[PDB]
Amino acid sequence: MPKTISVRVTTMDAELEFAIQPNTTGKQLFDQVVKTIGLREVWFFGLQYQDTKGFSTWLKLNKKVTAQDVRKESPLLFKFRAKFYPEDVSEELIQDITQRLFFLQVKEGILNDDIYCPPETAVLLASYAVQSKYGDFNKEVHKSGYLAGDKLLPQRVLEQHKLNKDQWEERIQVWHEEHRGMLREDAVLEYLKIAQDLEMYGVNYFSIKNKKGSELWLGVDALGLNIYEQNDRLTPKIGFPWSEIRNISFNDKKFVIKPIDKKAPDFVFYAPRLRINKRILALCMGNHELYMRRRKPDTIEVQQMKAQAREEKHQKQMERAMLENEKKKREMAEKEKEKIEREKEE
Numbered sequence: 001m002p003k004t005i006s007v008r009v010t011t012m013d014a015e016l017e018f019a020i021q022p023n024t025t026g027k028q029l030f031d032q033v034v035k036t037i038g039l040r041e042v043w044f045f046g047l048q049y050q051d052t053k054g055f056s057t058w059l060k061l062n063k064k065v066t067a068q069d070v071r072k073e074s075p076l077l078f079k080f081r082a083k084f085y086p087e088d089v090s091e092e093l094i095q096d097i098t099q100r101l102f103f104l105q106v107k108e109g110i111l112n113d114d115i116y117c118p119p120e121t122a123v124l125l126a127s128y129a130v131q132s133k134y135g136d137f138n139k140e141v142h143k144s145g146y147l148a149g150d151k152l153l154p155q156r157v158l159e160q161h162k163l164n165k166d167q168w169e170e171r172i173q174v175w176h177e178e179h180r181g182m183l184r185e186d187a188v189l190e191y192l193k194i195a196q197d198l199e200m201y202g203v204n205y206f207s208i209k210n211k212k213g214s215e216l217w218l219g220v221d222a223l224g225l226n227i228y229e230q231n232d233r234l235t236p237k238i239g240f241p242w243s244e245i246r247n248i249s250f251n252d253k254k255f256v257i258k259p260i261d262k263k264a265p266d267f268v269f270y271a272p273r274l275r276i277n278k279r280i281l282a283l284c285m286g287n288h289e290l291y292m293r294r295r296k297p298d299t300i301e302v303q304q305m306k307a308q309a310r311e312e313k314h315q316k317q318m319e320r321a322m323l324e325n326e327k328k329k330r331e332m333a334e335k336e337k338e339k340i341e342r343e344k345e346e
Contacts, residue, residue, distance in 0.1 A: 005066065006075035009033055009047070012104035017075070020065060027061035033080055040305065041098040043290070046083035049076070057279060058083055081105055084290055085202030087222055089192045092294070094305045096185060103188045106195050113154050116200050116234050123168075126152040127175030128191040132184035137177040147172060183320075199234045204283055206276060208255075208269045218255075218269065220283040222291060225257065227269070238267070242288055250277040 002021040007029065009016040018032055026047065034042050046058040052069045059078065060068055070076050082105050086092035093099045107129060109115045110122070117125065130147060147169040161167040179187065195201055205228075206218040217228040219236070224245065226236035246260035252274050257267040271277050298306070 007078065008075045009078045009080055011037060011080045012101050012108070016080075022064065022066050024065055025061065026059040026063060026065055026068075029059070029065055029078075030061055037080075037097070039095075039097055039101070040301075041094060044082050044084050044086070044098070044102075045080065048079045048081050048083075051275075053273065053275075055273075055276070057275075084286060085196075085222055086290075087294060089196050090189060093189075093192070094302070094309050099185070099188055099192070103192060106192065106201070110195060110198075111151050111154055113156055115195070115198055117154060117157070117195075117198060119157050119160070121194065121198070122153045122157045123171055124175060125191055125194055126172045127179060128187040128194070130172065130176050131179045131182060131187040132191075134176075135184070136180045136182075137173070145169065205233060206271070206280055208271050211268060211270070216269065218280060220280060220287060222287050225284070227267070240267075242291055248281065248284065250281060253277060255280065 002023070004019045004021055007018045007020055009018060009029075011033075014037065016033065016036065018029065020029055030042075030047055033047070034040075034045070039045070046061075048056060048058050050056055050071055052071060059065060065076075082102050085102075089099075089102065093102060106115070107125075110117050110125060129152065133150075134142065134146070145166070148165070152172055153168060158165070158168065182190075202221050203226075204220045206220070208216050208218050210216055215230045216237075217230065217233055219226040219228060219233075224242050225240040225248075227238045228235065229237055240257055244260055245257060247256075247258035249256050253270050253272070255269050255271070255277060259266065271280070
């Protein structure tokens, strides 16, 4: 019976709705979501919402949904996004669905200026993005100004030929054509190989303060923590790889990163609300757990996947060549229907 609560879950490309009750856990809602869309590499994902206080977090899967301050509005809003990024997408993103999702989430972040991207890289990124949307460049169907309708570059990157958007749709095409002979999938994965190397890719930024009260930025990623200055979020002032951490903890707004190396100092910072601290150590344990995972041998589930992937691919290199030949003929056959009709137009 229990009062039902309306829930909207937006994925990168989809739009979902569900129903939950007071005793429903985050994990239970999560599994309904992944079940639906058909995702198996769940370990990189999570459900994100906004704080009553205005922050952005990930629903805890072990506790009840309505038990962790949600906006208290209806329906409830959650975004199904990538929460942990791998160290090598080429090696760790096994299935397409998983690739497409990272791809869309990252592109959105590259296009909205959430992730810094130098102009030349943005242009190159756009080409791969068009290559997977439009396919090989066709000098016949792709009538100049074909790109004129979609977001290809960050606003920052634009404006440099502003009111001259044609120059961009021009520089981009130069590369689009340079990609003839590459499937949507490879383009996507190549986009990611490029993005995956940007200085602020896959970095969770937290606003903090120095022991004296200096506004800094903490960052958590698959490699450790970093402290950035208030005017720069691209370059770390101090680093903290896992191997350089022997113990981290907090005490209501006070964080402590115990060095593992030649008894260096002891970095400490202070966060406004208490949750922020709880969250930071959560991301860390998460990222570190995954950091370790990649180091140990592949599990068993993975081995099955990586396998039903290579074979799944091969089954699409043949199908890709079967639909190719049964039309590479259709040409030689219609180049005849012509050769003849033409010769007998007398």
